[PDB]
Design an enzyme around this catalytic site. Structure first.
Site, PDB file in Angstrom:
ATOM      1  N   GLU A 112       8.331  22.856   4.187  1.00 20.22           N
ATOM      2  CA  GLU A 112       8.968  23.306   5.602  1.00 20.22           C
ATOM      3  C   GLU A 112       7.763  23.253   6.360  1.00 20.22           C
ATOM      4  O   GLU A 112       7.822  23.409   7.598  1.00 20.22           O
ATOM      5  CB  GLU A 112       9.124  25.022   5.487  1.00 20.22           C
ATOM      6  CG  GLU A 112       7.807  25.651   5.469  1.00 20.22           C
ATOM      7  CD  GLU A 112       7.409  26.452   4.101  1.00 20.22           C
ATOM      8  OE1 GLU A 112       6.457  27.236   4.099  1.00 20.22           O
ATOM      9  OE2 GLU A 112       7.830  25.681   2.973  1.00 20.22           O
ATOM     10  N   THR A 168      -1.400  -3.942  -5.754  1.00 20.86           N
ATOM     11  CA  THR A 168      -0.454  -3.189  -6.452  1.00 20.86           C
ATOM     12  C   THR A 168      -0.193  -2.247  -5.348  1.00 20.86           C
ATOM     13  O   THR A 168       0.762  -1.307  -5.575  1.00 20.86           O
ATOM     14  CB  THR A 168      -0.771  -2.885  -7.770  1.00 20.86           C
ATOM     15  OG1 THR A 168      -1.750  -1.813  -7.670  1.00 20.86           O
ATOM     16  CG2 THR A 168      -1.542  -3.860  -8.395  1.00 20.86           C
TER      17      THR A 168
HETATM   18  N1  LIG Z   1     -10.491   5.232   0.501  1.00 24.43           N
HETATM   19  C1  LIG Z   1     -10.620   4.433  -0.720  1.00 24.43           C
HETATM   20  N2  LIG Z   1     -10.165   3.118  -0.343  1.00 24.43           N
HETATM   21  C2  LIG Z   1     -10.411   2.272  -1.197  1.00 24.43           C
HETATM   22  C3  LIG Z   1     -10.831   2.306  -2.419  1.00 24.43           C
HETATM   23  N3  LIG Z   1     -11.061   1.388  -3.188  1.00 24.43           N
HETATM   24  C4  LIG Z   1     -10.313   0.388  -2.499  1.00 24.43           C
HETATM   25  N4  LIG Z   1     -10.034   0.690  -1.357  1.00 24.43           N
HETATM   26  C5  LIG Z   1      -9.479   0.223  -0.172  1.00 24.43           C
HETATM   27  O1  LIG Z   1      -7.886   0.076  -0.510  1.00 24.43           O
HETATM   28  C6  LIG Z   1      -7.584  -1.078  -0.034  1.00 24.43           C
HETATM   29  C7  LIG Z   1      -7.481  -2.054  -1.192  1.00 24.43           C
HETATM   30  O2  LIG Z   1      -6.116  -1.773  -2.421  1.00 24.43           O
HETATM   31  P1  LIG Z   1      -6.381  -1.971  -3.709  1.00 24.43           P
HETATM   32  O3  LIG Z   1      -5.638  -0.869  -4.413  1.00 24.43           O
HETATM   33  O4  LIG Z   1      -8.064  -1.800  -4.242  1.00 24.43           O
HETATM   34  O5  LIG Z   1      -5.585  -3.433  -4.369  1.00 24.43           O
HETATM   35  P2  LIG Z   1      -4.546  -3.575  -5.675  1.00 24.43           P
HETATM   36  O6  LIG Z   1      -4.170  -4.490  -5.844  1.00 24.43           O
HETATM   37  O7  LIG Z   1      -3.342  -2.305  -4.990  1.00 24.43           O
HETATM   38  O8  LIG Z   1      -5.208  -2.728  -6.681  1.00 24.43           O
HETATM   39  P3  LIG Z   1      -6.084  -3.808  -7.494  1.00 24.43           P
HETATM   40  O9  LIG Z   1      -5.402  -4.449  -8.435  1.00 24.43           O
HETATM   41  O10 LIG Z   1      -7.336  -2.846  -7.787  1.00 24.43           O
HETATM   42  O11 LIG Z   1      -6.733  -4.652  -6.401  1.00 24.43           O
HETATM   43  C8  LIG Z   1      -8.491  -1.764   0.808  1.00 24.43           C
HETATM   44  O12 LIG Z   1      -8.358  -1.059   1.989  1.00 24.43           O
HETATM   45  C9  LIG Z   1      -9.970  -0.988   0.404  1.00 24.43           C
HETATM   46  O13 LIG Z   1     -10.740  -0.794   1.501  1.00 24.43           O
HETATM   47  C10 LIG Z   1     -11.348   3.675  -2.706  1.00 24.43           C
HETATM   48  O14 LIG Z   1     -12.066   4.158  -3.730  1.00 24.43           O
HETATM   49  N5  LIG Z   1     -11.105   4.737  -1.860  1.00 24.43           N
END
Ligand SMILES: Nc1nc2c(ncn2[C@@H]2O[C@H](COP(=O)(O)OP(=O)(O)OP(=O)(O)O)[C@@H](O)[C@H]2O)c(=O)[nH]1
Ligand SMILES: Nc1nc2c(ncn2[C@@H]2O[C@H](COP(=O)(O)OP(=O)(O)OP(=O)(O)O)[C@@H](O)[C@H]2O)c(=O)[nH]1
Ligand SMILES: COc1cc2c(c(OC)c1OC)-c1ccc(OC)c(=O)cc1[C@@H](NC(=O)CS)CC2
Ligand SMILES: COc1cc2c(c(OC)c1OC)-c1ccc(OC)c(=O)cc1[C@@H](NC(=O)CS)CC2
Ligand SMILES: Nc1nc2c(ncn2[C@@H]2O[C@H](COP(=O)(O)OP(=O)(O)O)[C@@H](O)[C@H]2O)c(=O)[nH]1
Ligand SMILES: Nc1nc2c(ncn2[C@@H]2O[C@H](COP(=O)(O)OP(=O)(O)O)[C@@H](O)[C@H]2O)c(=O)[nH]1
EC number: 3.6.5.-
Lengths: 426, 438, 121, 428, 426
Positions: free
Chosen positions: B253, B144
């Site tokens: 800006e 997502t």
């Molecule tokens: N910087 C940071 N990166 C994260 C974290 N958790 C997951 N990630 C990273 O973010 C990416 C994953 O995206 P997600 O948002 O977890 O997947 P999503 O489907 O969009 O959300 P979910 O349904 O939870 O999976 C990967 O590169 C992970 O390394 C966090 O707490 N901090």
């Protein structure tokens, strides 16, 4: 999400009895009783494998199918027998058959519904679904046959929701039985069409593990069986447990499988066996890993070697440091960098979970989408094709109501998979 | 005038929650709500209201949406103190998960929640006379974070024409748990994202992880370990528009300032003095040096180097006890013993902004108390490095259709994939192109 | 010098006289030239009111053709949205309700050729 | 018979106001009015006031307001003081076309309204700044028109020809050249008064480091007293205006006489004097004591004419002119006898009491017309030329409505006059 | 005549805050309060800069414009904040922009009227008009942009009445902001078309004055600013004061400017900066003049040297004798006679006024229409052209509603002026 379980057949139904009672031991359940375990974690995502009912007590999300009573009262009169909700028991009366036809057509679509329709309840009951997982023998009948059917009927009642099978591909040493290949090749066809993941647990290894590496003179059905039970344990841990990130079983599919054809992971497990021989504990992490990427440390007969890995995933077990794990794995794609698909980048992913299994201070489990696995296929196909040769024991399916050529269009489906599996060393 | 934080995706959210906390620890909101500091809420006329709207008579409430297609993450926030900080409405959770693919978020399971999100979004900027835009936090790759985000973005750029959009993207490094399919996801979103975004703070995990091994000295870099680090970058990047002063104001800006050419240009950041309590008592660090060590490949944000790629807009963001007379003849010196690198036609930049405000860090943190801190938002043709480090991962997976169908199934086309990478093709060439000249 | 100086006039308060020393030896019907002044002014300025009446309604135009250049952005790819996100329902209900329409022919082939036991001993 | 004074322009007015004062101080008019052959300039009011035959006209207030302020405030009908809102802003363009047109019909009224009561008006004395706004612009337009509504009645211009230091302004050359072209056919005779030379006199004999504006005026007013006067107290050399051009100008072209007031000397020295009836004459024949910055010893003479005042009987002048001849550069041009029409006036040459000049027992004046006034005609025309050779300031006029071919063709007339002059000059 | 004031922009609005409160100090006004100053002169031509209202009190003829509140409550909450009539306060709410487009089109013609229409009152109110004088930054927006607009709308409501601007042409050291040239070159176009006089105050000098010659380490916005404030003070003196002859601003245009193209006088000022040793008061007259005709002592970066003067004017300050001034100036067109246009005769005019400014027993100010000033232009033009080069940060004006080529037909106007300014060394 949350997953329900179909357990079907003499095999499928020990395979899971033994399964249940080692997962039930992890989160800690009496016969029905609540939870008793001074380590608090457990109940996090016990949602997945347990629908909870009347009183503080527990009940698995499981449904049990057999086309002859016997092997049901094996579970009730047995280990954790008092645990399953009685109308999750679907016994077939009749005659099992132990010939796929019977279980997929005649004595099968005899029961089918009663099953299909308790699955309907348990499922459409649980808060929101994940998919289904089923266990069974891929040879013999009821479960090889009744089962393949269920999924081919689950799909359609549940199409968006996805699929998991522990399928014990059978061998010639350990259970004879004229027919197996026939049933197997029939089901291999079945599977490849409509699951997204299937674990290929083979008996030719399962036995050969229990022999040449594990003293066991004449390896039992139990003492053996055991291996798989512990194997399923790891293979579920990360949907079953932490917060060290989740496991949509989907996430696990659309990551493990590059190519729609449900490529059956060969599994493997770290420590093994012993009543009379386990005292090691000194099972290190180096010594653990290069033991998990071993030939006869896999559940499929099949050495990676004769095939590269497509994608691999490992799950680790116990208070141990990834300081050491991260670095140990990242050595296996080095000292072995050659036999891993070039073209799928971080196709080795691992995870660590700090709660041991039954016994064992340290343990790892392996998930192996590798081309080499066609080794298991090129085998059953030729065990088959060498029978379908002189159109063999087939008058047994002839008459139960099949066509002459369905055997071919399933030989020539396996014999297909064979060579896209072979096709993928490019 | 006012600013909304949309958090989408596991990462997005966890950065949010553990960044919005550094927001509170700076303006003085103990979860609860009330900042028994001056007034607002009996007449919100303070400079701190940039992000919050004052509630009833007590609580202080962010202008926030947290949106994920699972529970878990957001249930986190509804559990750990701060549970008290939001209207339960600002937290949108959505049953079935995005299962790690742009296909999912943007088409199937996204379509379902988007209209509900897009509501409370309005419902927020609706009380707010003169909203000036969005800060969207999301994961570069993964479900997502890539999928919905894009859909979100597509749509905002509709219901709010003007109001610009800043994405904070977490570009995924190999070790800090990715997943195979990622390349696809990031290349997917970032194509369909980029004309609806105005400016984009890419934050490569490696480099953050790296910094945590490096100076923080953690063998393990924890998930919430990386966040406290980044939240600080995020604090410093915002802030200029948060509390105020004659010192400096907005990125309204600092965009004007950062990106010259339609294409969303992705600034790289470089937070100043990260050092670990255990060493909270070595400090007061050279007003020159913080600067001078922020000009460092090893102290970056994205895994590249700006010494093999020209610069096209530098911009320091300072915080704490610093009067200009320092910065000034300490820039001349960040100019003589250095690989300068200014591309043909962008003067020789450095718009700078001090903020006076003590750079408050977290109390259960690892970073320590600081007397002054830098930030550096420089846009460089070297950010283009990360653009093919990813594109390579993409290519050769796609060169065998690798995981394609898991999308095509959930409803996509092949020629999306084909034509999206046929756009990074352009950006990568656009980039290195504008770069170094004759 | 040897000058003479024949004497000219005597008043209650004056006198004049030559003292010679050595021989001797409109009309304006034409202020049309003045209306003209303004015929040129009120031109040369009633034409910086109409070289500037112009500077004007382009201003009230330029900022009107960005309201025109942005109305027409909701126009295109802000609906490309809806009939691409439809070319989703299209593309799926095809691949789904066609994964249903084959996993449904192991129904006809499994029922009208199981009623094969119509054979029997 | 009777005489009108039109003052136009800042200079014109200030010279007017500070000379009209020396008028009063001579016939004994208390500001109020009553002074318990002199009506030549004034018309007697009701029964008390004495009121000048004057018009003061400017296109600002300021100048004229201070006349409506400083005593004298009592001397005029408020009607004779015409002020005009928006300023001429320093260009012939303005005066003569734009903001001039607006007030010209109103002036021209009260002008009539004045010579109307007056049985036999004999002409006008117009005072104005040579260069600068309304002094050049309006003046011309004034002049154009008078020469219409009053055909006969001659016109005497007193022009303040502008010197570099005593505050000019860049654009001036343009303005003087402009007016003086379009002026010169409507004028009969013209007393050019170069500032330098007045200013110089002031540093010289008066001994003022600073020469004050009104410092310069008290000086010039005296010249102006002595030039008029002969028609004011009556007693020939020129009792009437048409007697001016009889004696001073031989050729249509407006000829510009230069004057030379006699003994300027500063109280402080008011008790050295009774100055040689010869000398006053003999120092008046002095480049250093002039009026216009030239010299009549490098240009021929074409009508000399002394104006005397005070206790002086002819038997002096006479064998004192003979001597103003023998030790002098005579210079009489081929055919103009050897002039000197002289006029004594008996009248104590009264000067101002808060002044710097002192009481005098006799004073001279000298109105000579010479081909050396022609120097001042190119000293100006050069300034013009090389400004115009780059259009310099041109458009500030073309805007306000002028033509280019005005400028071009006006300088193409001074071209003639300058050639006219030097031409008639020294012969064979 | 009488002049009204438009003050527009964060710059334009301090520039004038600082202006007002040094002129108000000269004629002597409390916050509103009447006059307190034992020297009588002052009120003569206080008509010019002050419309007088209710009670003995005073109010400036000024109107204030900004496209964001902020910098107005800077003036109210500040120095002589209580002085200005509240409906002479036109604040824009909105967003400044700081990009000409915004201020001359979108956020601009948003306010415009409210401004335009208060000027209307204040102007068509005062007894008879002179012109207008506005102050602003020539780079950044609202003021560089809104302002240029105002004048382009004043002209037309007020055509016969003429035009004055204090326009701070901007630099790169002191305020960065990657855009400035764009705005500047846009406005340079603007100005040249429709004012008759503009003072070119350049920051590059203003800063370099405050450095090189005036200790100031890191020169403030205030401590700096100050210079201009004192520079405007002189440049107005002779319209603001005596009876030592008047000043129709016109009478100052049609004398300073030979050539319609509003030739921007570079200004300069005599003493400078601080309470110390110019505050020792032995600033003599020789020592004053040859310091006013200095390179380092002008408000525009630009040494006369590289350009002759067209016409110049100086205004002197204090009980000092012209015995010395007349003679000291008439020396500078000697031991410098060479760099002064041949062809415009008394093209140096000077005036003396006997009332000192803030502090300072002696002071002079300089008005310089010199060809050299194109040095300032040849400068911004190439700061520009080197951006409009790779059609730079321009997507910022692209989209706000401009045409690609308006940038050219204004580059190619400045780049014109450049070379009639160059053209005038013949
Ligand atoms: N910087 C940071 N990166 C994260 C974290 N958790 C997951 N990630 C990273 O973010 C990416 C994953 O995206 P997600 O948002 O977890 O997947 P999503 O489907 O969009 O959300 P979910 O349904 O939870 O999976 C990967 O590169 C992970 O390394 C966090 O707490 N901090
Ligand atoms: N002799 C003398 N000359 C003066 C005086 N005042 C101004 N001038 C001169 O006349 C010229 C300027 O003429 P003005 O009379 O001021 O011009 P104007 O437009 O008619 O008057 P304004 O309405 O004030 O603009 C300059 O060359 C001055 O040297 C004065 O009081 N005495
Ligand atoms: C038990 O739950 C599991 C669930 C998943 C995975 C997995 O394998 C370790 C599991 O264990 C069996 C999984 C799979 C595979 C990947 O490629 C090998 C990947 O990158 C990623 C993963 C999982 N991990 C992550 O998303 C962080 S690596 C996602 C789904
Ligand atoms: C605003 O008040 C001023 C107004 C003006 C002048 C001036 O000096 C610079 C001023 O001081 C600031 C002025 C200027 C210029 C001239 O050309 C150099 C000139 O000849 C003449 C002048 C001014 N003075 C005079 O013309 C008497 S010398 C009139 C216009
Ligand atoms: N390894 C494993 N295989 C089993 C077990 N029980 C039976 N099998 C195998 O499964 C196959 C027969 O399946 P079975 O379940 O007995 O028949 P069904 O009840 O008709 O499905 C043979 O190849 C057996 O070797 C078991 O306990 N574990
Ligand atoms: N010196 C002077 N210049 C200023 C001041 N403030 C800003 N500037 C200059 O003007 C430019 C910025 O324009 P500004 O007026 O601040 O933006 P605006 O509010 O949109 O008009 C920069 O080149 C600055 O150097 C100040 O008040 N004084």
């Amino acid at each position: 999400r949350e997953i329900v379980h179909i357990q079907a057949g003499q095999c499928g139904n020990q395979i899971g009895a033994k399964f249940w009672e080692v997962i039930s031991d992890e989160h800690g359940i009496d016969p029905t009783g609540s939870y008793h375990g001074d380590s608090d974690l457990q109940l996090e995502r016990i949602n997945v494998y347990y629908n909870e009912a009347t009183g503080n007590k527990y009940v698995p999300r499981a449904i049990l199918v057999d086309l002859e009573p016997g092997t049901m009262d094996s579970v009730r009169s047995g280990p954790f027998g008092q645990i399953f909700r009685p109308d999750n028991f679907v016994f077939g009366q009749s005659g099992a058959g132990n010939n796929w036809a019977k279980g997929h057509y005649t004595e099968g679509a005899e029961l089918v519904d009663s099953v299909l329709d308790v699955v309907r309840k348990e499922s459409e009951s649980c808060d929101c679904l994940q998919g289904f997982q089923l266990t069974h023998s891929l040879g013999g009948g009821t479960g090889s046959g009744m089962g393949t059917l269920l999924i081919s009927k689950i799909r359609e009642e549940y199409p968006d929701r996805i699929m998991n099978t522990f399928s014990v591909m059978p061998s010639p040493k350990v259970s004879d039985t004229v027919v197996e290949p026939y049933n197997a090749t029939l089901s291999v066809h079945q599977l490849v069409e409509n699951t997204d993941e299937t674990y290929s647990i083979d008996n030719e290894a399962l036995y050969d593990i229990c022999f040449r590496t594990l003293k066991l003179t004449t390896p039992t059905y139990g003492d053996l069986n055991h291996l798989v039970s512990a194997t399923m344990s790891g293979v579920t841990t990360c949907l079953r447990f932490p917060g060290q990130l989740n496991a949509d079983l989907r996430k696990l599919a659309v990551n493990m499988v590059p190519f729609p054809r449900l490529h059956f992971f060969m599994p493997g497990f770290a420590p093994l066996t012993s009543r009379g021989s386990q005292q090691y504990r000194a099972l290190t992490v180096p010594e653990l890993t290069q033991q998990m990427f071993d030939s006869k440390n896999m559940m499929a007969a099949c050495d990676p070697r004769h095939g590269r890995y497509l994608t691999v995933a490992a799950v680790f077990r116990g208070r141990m440091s990834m300081k050491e794990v991260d670095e140990q794995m990242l050595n296996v794609q080095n000292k072995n960098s050659s036999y891993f698909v070039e073209w799928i980048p971080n196709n080795v992913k691992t995870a660590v979970c700090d709660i041991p299994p039954r016994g064992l201070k340290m343990s790892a489990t392996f998930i192996g989408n590798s081309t080499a696995i066609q080794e298991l296929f090129k085998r059953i196909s030729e065990q088959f094709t060498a029978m379908f040769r002189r159109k063999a024991f087939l008058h047994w399916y002839t008459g139960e109501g099949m066509d002459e050529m369905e055997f071919t269009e399933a030989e020539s489906n396996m014999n297909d998979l064979v060579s896209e599996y072979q096709q993928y060393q490019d | 005038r006012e600013c909304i934080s949309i958090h989408v995706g596991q990462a997005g959210v966890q950065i949010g929650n553990a960044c919005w906390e550094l927001y509170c620890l700076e303006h003085g909101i103990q979860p609860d709500g009330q900042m028994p500091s001056d007034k607002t809420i009996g007449g919100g006329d303070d400079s701190f209201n940039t992000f919050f709207s004052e509630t009833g008579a007590g609580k202080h409430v962010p202008r926030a949406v947290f949106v994920d297609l699972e529970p878990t993450v957001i249930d986190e926030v509804r559990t750990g103190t701060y549970r008290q900080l939001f209207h339960p409405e600002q937290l949108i959770s959505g049953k079935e998960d995005a299962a790690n693919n742009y296909a999912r978020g943007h088409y199937t399971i996204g379509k379902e929640i988007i209209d509900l999100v897009l509501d409370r979004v309005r419902k927020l900027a609706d009380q707010c006379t003169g909203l000036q835009g969005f800060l969207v936090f999301h994961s570069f790759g993964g479900g997502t974070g890539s999928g919905f985000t894009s859909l979100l973005m597509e749509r905002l750029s509709v219901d709010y024409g003007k109001k610009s959009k800043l994405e904070f993207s977490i570009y995924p490094a190999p070790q800090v748990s990715t997943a195979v399919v990622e390349p696809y996801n990031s290349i997917l979103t970032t194509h369909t994202t980029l004309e609806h975004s105005d400016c984009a703070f890419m934050v490569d995990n490696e480099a953050i992880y790296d910094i945590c091994r490096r100076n923080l000295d953690i063998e393990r870099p924890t998930y919430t370990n990386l966040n406290r680090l980044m939240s600080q970058i995020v604090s410093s990047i915002t802030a200029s528009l948060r509390f105020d002063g004659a010192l400096n104001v907005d990125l309204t800006e600092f965009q004007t300032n950062l990106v010259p050419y339609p294409r969303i240009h992705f600034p790289l950041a470089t937070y100043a003095p990260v050092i670990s309590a255990e060493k909270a008592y070595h400090e007061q660090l050279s007003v020159a040096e913080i600067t001078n060590a922020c000009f460092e490949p090893a102290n970056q944000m994205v895994k590249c180097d700006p010494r093999h790629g020209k610069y096209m807009a530098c911009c320091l963001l300072y915080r704490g006890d610093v009067v200009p007379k320092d910065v000034n003849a300490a820039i001349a010196t960040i100019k003589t013993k250095r690989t300068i690198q200014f591309v043909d036609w962008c003067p020789t930049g450095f718009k700078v902004g001090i903020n006076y405000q003590p750079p408050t860090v977290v109390p259960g943190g690892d970073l320590a108390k600081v007397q002054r801190a830098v930030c550096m938002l420089s846009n460089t043709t070297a950010v283009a490095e990360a653009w093919a480090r990813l594109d390579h991962k993409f290519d050769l997976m796609y060169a065998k259709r690798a995981f394609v169908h898991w999308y095509v199934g959930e409803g996509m086309e092949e020629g999306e994939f084909s034509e999206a990478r046929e756009d990074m093709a352009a950006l990568e060439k656009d980039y290195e192109e504008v770069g170094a000249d004759s | 010098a040897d000058m003479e100086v024949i004497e000219l006039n005597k008043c209650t308060s004056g006198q004049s006289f030559e003292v010679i020393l050595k021989p001797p030896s409109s009309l304006e019907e034409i202020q049309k030239k003045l209306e003209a002044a303004e015929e040129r002014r009120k031109y040369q300025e009633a034409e910086l009111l109409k070289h500037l009446a112009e500077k004007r309604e382009h201003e009230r135009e330029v900022i009107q053709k960005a309201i025109e250049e942005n109305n027409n952005f909701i126009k295109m790819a802000k609906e490309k949205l809806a009939q691409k996100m439809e070319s989703n329902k299209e593309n799926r209900e095809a691949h789904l309700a066609a994964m249903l329409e084959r996993l449904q022919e192991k129904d006809k082939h499994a029922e009208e050729v199981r009623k094969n036991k119509e054979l029997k001993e």
